[PDB]
Structure 1
Amino acid sequence: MKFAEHLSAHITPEWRKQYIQYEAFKDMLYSAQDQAPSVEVTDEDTVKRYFAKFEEKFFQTCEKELAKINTFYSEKLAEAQRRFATLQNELQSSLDAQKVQHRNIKDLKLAFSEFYLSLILLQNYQNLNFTGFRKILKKHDKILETSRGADWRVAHVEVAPFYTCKKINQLISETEAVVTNELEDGDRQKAMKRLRVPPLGAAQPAPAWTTFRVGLFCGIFIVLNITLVLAAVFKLETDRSIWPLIRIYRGGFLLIEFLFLLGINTYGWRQAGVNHVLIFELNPRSNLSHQHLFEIAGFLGILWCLSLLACFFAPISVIPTYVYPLALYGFMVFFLINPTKTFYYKSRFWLLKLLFRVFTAPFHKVGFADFWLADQLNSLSVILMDLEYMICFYSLELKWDESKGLLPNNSEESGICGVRAIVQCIPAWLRFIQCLRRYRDTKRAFPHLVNAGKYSTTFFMVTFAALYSTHKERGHSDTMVFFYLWIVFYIISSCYTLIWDLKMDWGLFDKNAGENTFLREEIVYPQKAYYYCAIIEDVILRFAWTIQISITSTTLLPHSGDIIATVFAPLEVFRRFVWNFFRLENEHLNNCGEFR
């Protein structure tokens, strides 16, 4: 509960291999002390010899660590000096060409903010490495009852060209002078507000009020869920179709679950070290922690349960029950498109810019955030089918003349209410067109043309499912050829998406696995059982995702298809939750998508 965990939490994740390696030294010291011979059953000269050999070993490995740190610091400082040179040349060129321009100035501001962050990170590297050297030499002096630790400290560590190099501080002062004089016309307060680096990474605890709001929204949600179960068992009339209600309130629940699991994903990414900040292109001084995602999910789930309870209980008699789902989803939309500057404005508007860039995306160049949201839409595809069902049900099947709305006595439609497939492929189409744009951009046909057929398989599966459904509904003869076609494309799609998940989305099953059998060379998440369980769960849940797509866009299994979809949709959201971890891990470790 000291500098070991302080070091693990304050390490820059991409430079983890070039730090002090505190725990190795600690284990070396403890093992040396443990296997020390006796003091009177053995010879004292042998004890002196053993302790001298251990001292030699310790100082050899300490010299190796110091050399590593010096090499890394020299490389990084040279890089920063070159970056400052080119940035000053760019600013000089832009400002003398000044006598568009706004975009140029914004990009210069952003480049100077990222140059400052690298300097701050290198400074923190220096500080942590020096403090780790002092603490471990102190532990050596304490464990062995000697003074060679502080001797080696004063002799070697405080001469090293990484503790005596006051060149990063000059660079920081120079950068501040540049940003203040040439980019802000004085006004150092505004420059430093843009340049100052808050304690980042796993090194910040969320405000107590955010955690209290998480806990408050979670308790209300829990009690309202208990109340929903009790009101479903004891208050729903036993002569009405509750299935329209289930279909309407299914998409909201999937959204709440997705936000909860995204919060858990953010916690795992922040803890294991894989920084979604650099991959998503978020600014490192302001991100959403897992607490904010948990709070958003809890609020939206509170609203969901309140609307469902109002549907079950019908509190007031003037307003019919179909207003409650409308109200819930209208508030959900008004939360997202809130034009004021309140309630997570930066996050919501980043998300809206992303949604405009994924729903119109043969024209925008694909980043990682444009790809992850279009991949997450594949799991949240039942939300679009729920929206289409809500529109169809309110336009064609709701009476509007009786307060008892969503729950009708007995009546149906042709299927359930063509355009129930198109709205299943929509996200597959987005990802297909994005992969095509990426191929056109990079001209590298392997990762992009492959992974475009990955979604053409979904296209073909939905098409042939719908064809066989309509042909078995009207009792035709060429129905069997279509059933075999659908089964072959189901197998093809399941294996295609399964191989891509494990091979070049997660990186697993590589030739250089080493001792991590069937895994990557370097794993980030602690337990090895996490990866094997994830493999098994993805194998199970990937096959029971194409089945749901086939059964949602069809008319077969009318009674059991809805139970199937209701059970399998949160399972698919959980599958995407599991997929996020290892996709993000294999993007930090190896560009898997060639972004960056």
Structure 2
Amino acid sequence: KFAEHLSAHITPEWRKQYIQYEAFKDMLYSAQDQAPSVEVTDEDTVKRYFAKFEEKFFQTCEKELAKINTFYSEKLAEAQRRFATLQNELQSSLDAQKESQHRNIKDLKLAFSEFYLSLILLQNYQNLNFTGFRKILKKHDKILETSRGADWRVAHVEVAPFYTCKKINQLISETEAVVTNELEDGDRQKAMKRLRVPPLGAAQPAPAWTTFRVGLFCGIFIVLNITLVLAAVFKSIWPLIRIYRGGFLLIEFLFLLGINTYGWRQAGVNHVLIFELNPRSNLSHQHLFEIAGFLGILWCLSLLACFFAPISVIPTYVYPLALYGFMVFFLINPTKTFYYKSRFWLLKLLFRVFTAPFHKVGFADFWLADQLNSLSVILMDLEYMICFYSLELKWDESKGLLPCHKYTYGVRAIVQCIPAWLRFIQCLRRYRDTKRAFPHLVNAGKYSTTFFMVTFAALYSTHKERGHSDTMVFFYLWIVFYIISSCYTLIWDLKMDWGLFDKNAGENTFLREEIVYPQKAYYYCAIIEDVILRFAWTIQISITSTTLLPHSGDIIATVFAPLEVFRRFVWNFFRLENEHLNNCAEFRAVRDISVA
């Protein structure tokens, strides 16, 4: 009907400021079903019941129209002030450049684009709220056989500045004119081609070729996985799983990111605005599903080529090497094709993460540097593969893949602490920037314990190998720091990265006041799953960096790795939801762009 249409063209952050068409329909239906029968009753009581119901309905309409008009006036004042500011800024910039550049002009163009998008969203809100108001009043009129409905409509709704003001329309026209003149030297077409606003959020569908390709890649993937299982069961192996564990984690991750983006699109957790992508065009969930499926096809094919031996000229150790060489070349492809805009956004982001303490920390660069705390197994397996191919590989006999173990020399500890270091120094940069110690240093005191845990694990491993007597006290220190860097991380997650256990639970017990994901068992299952998978993950870390007996010293590492990429997949939902929820209380919908 329409109650769905209000949930596909609504801008998510302005939720409570919209109509309450859902609640109005509930009120109407409940009053109708509750309204007793007059045929078995008197007249005065039932007609007074109708009267009081009408009065309550009208008071609710009063409050609703007042709220809508106030919010729209506030947003119009804000947009007018922002347009005045940006116009003065453009004027001053033009005068300065005439009296006396690319990075300035591009940012100015983008600021104008974001302002036009804010205007479009305000206009859409106006139109949708008016439509919902009209529909919910016509329904009441039809169900209560009353004529005063449209009378009071034309009296009060058809006069309010909520829709009887065309300032937004003339501002849109003025913005169009000013951009196409100043920033374009005429040629309205090349300006409008980017000023246009296609449907955003859950409204945009897939090009249907992307859904076909998702299907094709998932089908080939399923058949190759079944072929893999069958080949492995019918037709040592540790350097062959310790090399494809990296690819497995990186396929699982860019699918659980596809699932995450679908969850965000549906639930209304605006990730577009939070990451600061551009809201006109971005990657929906199917594009991530398709990238994950393609890289999974490549992984399965390389694994199969290792299992069988199709070509007798190419030795086996070229298959994983070629798979990862591809993966990297696909990521670093310089020609403008195969997701070029997206790969180069991601590459600039990865650079800004990896040289951390210099650039100002946004949100994408501490979502990614915090999500790289789950692919430490990928980094360790890549370090191990490099160690293999450069120090131990037989390089001959076409068997060197299936024939760098006592890593306690001080390399595996560092390559496992490197993402913890990235995030620690990012938080220190955030502190230097904000000059607020909380939360920016209590959070550094969460990643600063990973260093201590891994260092004590390595030292206890070395001392148990030696045979000293202080191995007991080192093991005790390690178990203390394990308990810490587990309970610290768990409390921190549940209390600041998701926001749960707030002072204002109320009906939503153990949760914040407003929850975006519909069913309330989700958060409880996630709480329990995180409490379990945050433990045993520090176990996996301390075990991949020790001298435990390789049997059951590595099976645990390869079992708990894709069971922790899952923990991160679950954590993503609620981190991004809590962030959206802190932007759904400031009524923000457009990435403030800062002219130069």
Band of TM-score, shorter chain:
over 0.9
**Change over 3 Å in CA distance of 1:593–1:50 after alignment to 2:** closer
- Give the C-alpha shift of residue 556 in structure 1: 1.3
- Give the C-alpha shift of residue 364 in structure 1: 0.7
Partners in 1 of 2:343 and 2:373 — Cα distance? 21
Partners in 1 of 2:74 and 2:333 — Cα distance? 47
Contact 1:22 1:132 in 2 (8 A): yes
**Post-superposition CA distance 1:439-480 (Å, at most 9, x none):** 111111121111112111000111110111111112222211
Contact 2:306 2:316 in 1 (8 A): yes
Of residues 513, 516, 520 in structure 2, which corresponds to 1:521? 513
- Give the C-alpha shift of residue 384 in structure 1: 0.3
Contact 2:158 2:164 in 1 (8 A): yes
What residue number does 2:126 align with? 126
Partners in 1 of 2:149 and 2:266 — Cα distance? 33
**Post-superposition CA distance 1:130-175 (Å, at most 9, x none):** 1101111121122223333322322221111111101000100111
**Post-superposition CA distance 1:480-512 (Å, at most 9, x none):** 111111111100100111111011111111112
Partners in 2 of 1:341 and 1:149 — Cα distance? 58
TM score, norm. by length of structure 2: 0.95
Gaps of 5+ in 2: 404-409, 588-596
Contact 1:221 1:305 in 2 (8 A): yes
Q: Following superposition of structure 1 onto structure 2, how do residues 396-407 of structure 1 map, counting pairs within 5 Å?
A: 396-407=391-402
- Give the C-alpha shift of residue 592 in structure 1: 12
Contact 2:353 2:365 in 1 (8 A): yes
- The percent of aligned pairs where both chains have the same amino acid is 100
Contact 2:376 2:416 in 1 (8 A): yes
Partners in 2 of 1:174 and 1:462 — Cα distance? 61
Partners in 1 of 2:582 and 2:541 — Cα distance? 32
**Post-superposition CA distance 1:312-366 (Å, at most 9, x none):** 1111211111111011101100110010111111110000000110111111111
Contact 1:504 1:592 in 2 (8 A): no
Partners in 2 of 1:199 and 1:207 — Cα distance? 13
Partners in 1 of 2:553 and 2:136 — Cα distance? 63
Q: Following superposition of structure 1 onto structure 2, how do residues 16-415 of structure 1 map, counting pairs within 5 Å?
A: 16-99=15-98, 101-235=101-235, 241-408=236-403
Partners in 2 of 1:470 and 1:274 — Cα distance? 48
SS at match of 1:449: coil
Partners in 2 of 1:445 and 1:60 — Cα distance? 47
Partners in 2 of 1:592 and 1:354 — Cα distance? 26
**Post-superposition CA distance 1:410-456 (Å, at most 9, x none):** xxxxxxxx211100000000001111111111111121111112111
- Give the C-alpha shift of residue 591 in structure 1: 6.5
Contact 1:420 1:553 in 2 (8 A): yes
- Give the C-alpha shift of residue 90 in structure 1: 0.3
**Post-superposition CA distance 1:195-215 (Å, at most 9, x none):** 111110111111211111111
Contact 2:315 2:399 in 1 (8 A): yes
**Post-superposition CA distance 1:263-289 (Å, at most 9, x none):** 111111111111111111101011111
Of residues 430, 450, 454 in structure 1, which corresponds to 2:446? 454
Partners in 2 of 1:152 and 1:269 — Cα distance? 40
Contact 1:505 1:592 in 2 (8 A): no
**Change over 3 Å in CA distance of 1:178–1:353 after alignment to 2:** same
Partners in 2 of 1:222 and 1:162 — Cα distance? 54
- Give the C-alpha shift of residue 521 in structure 1: 1.5
**Change over 3 Å in CA distance of 1:29–1:582 after alignment to 2:** same
Contact 2:454 2:542 in 1 (8 A): yes
**Post-superposition CA distance 1:239-276 (Å, at most 9, x none):** xx111101100011101111111111111111111111
Contact 2:141 2:149 in 1 (8 A): yes
What residue number does 1:238 align with? none
Contact 1:133 1:153 in 2 (8 A): no
**Change over 3 Å in CA distance of 1:36–1:593 after alignment to 2:** closer
Partners in 2 of 1:455 and 1:70 — Cα distance? 48
Contact 2:13 2:584 in 1 (8 A): no
Partners in 1 of 2:314 and 2:368 — Cα distance? 37
- Give the C-alpha shift of residue 371 in structure 1: 0.2
Partners in 2 of 1:395 and 1:200 — Cα distance? 50
Which stretch shifts more, 394-403 or 337-346?
394-403
Partners in 2 of 1:22 and 1:147 — Cα distance? 21
Partners in 1 of 2:276 and 2:131 — Cα distance? 31
Contact 2:13 2:583 in 1 (8 A): no
Which stretch shifts more, 586-595 or 300-309?
586-595
**Change over 3 Å in CA distance of 1:592–1:64 after alignment to 2:** closer
Which stretch shifts more, 264-273 or 49-58?
49-58
Partners in 2 of 1:561 and 1:151 — Cα distance? 78
SS at match of 1:171: helix
Partners in 2 of 1:242 and 1:591 — Cα distance? 50
Superposed CA RMSD in Å reads: 1.6
Contact 2:243 2:385 in 1 (8 A): yes
Contact 2:500 2:512 in 1 (8 A): yes
- Give the C-alpha shift of residue 395 in structure 1: 1.3
Contact 2:501 2:512 in 1 (8 A): yes
**Change over 3 Å in CA distance of 1:551–1:260 after alignment to 2:** same
Partners in 2 of 1:545 and 1:135 — Cα distance? 53
Contact 1:200 1:285 in 2 (8 A): yes
Q: How many residues align?
A: 579
- Give the C-alpha shift of residue 593 in structure 1: 15
- Give the C-alpha shift of residue 568 in structure 1: 0.4
- Give the C-alpha shift of residue 522 in structure 1: 1.1
Partners in 1 of 2:174 and 2:344 — Cα distance? 34
**Post-superposition CA distance 1:542-592 (Å, at most 9, x none):** 011100000001111321011101110011101111111111111112279
Which stretch shifts more, 47-56 or 501-510?
47-56
**Change over 3 Å in CA distance of 1:106–1:170 after alignment to 2:** same
- Give the C-alpha shift of residue 54 in structure 1: 1.8
Contact 1:509 1:518 in 2 (8 A): yes
SS at match of 2:423: helix
Partners in 2 of 1:419 and 1:223 — Cα distance? 39
TM score, norm. by length of structure 1: 0.95
**Post-superposition CA distance 1:517-552 (Å, at most 9, x none):** 111121111111111111111000001110000000
Contact 1:587 1:593 in 2 (8 A): no
SS at match of 2:316: coil
Partners in 2 of 1:588 and 1:275 — Cα distance? 6
Partners in 1 of 2:343 and 2:584 — Cα distance? 28
Partners in 2 of 1:15 and 1:190 — Cα distance? 31
Of residues 576, 584, 594 in structure 2, which corresponds to 1:592? 584
- Give the C-alpha shift of residue 46 in structure 1: 3.4
Partners in 1 of 2:399 and 2:538 — Cα distance? 36
Partners in 2 of 1:545 and 1:579 — Cα distance? 14
Q: Following superposition of structure 1 onto structure 2, how do residues 549-560 of structure 1 map, counting pairs within 5 Å?
A: 549-560=541-552
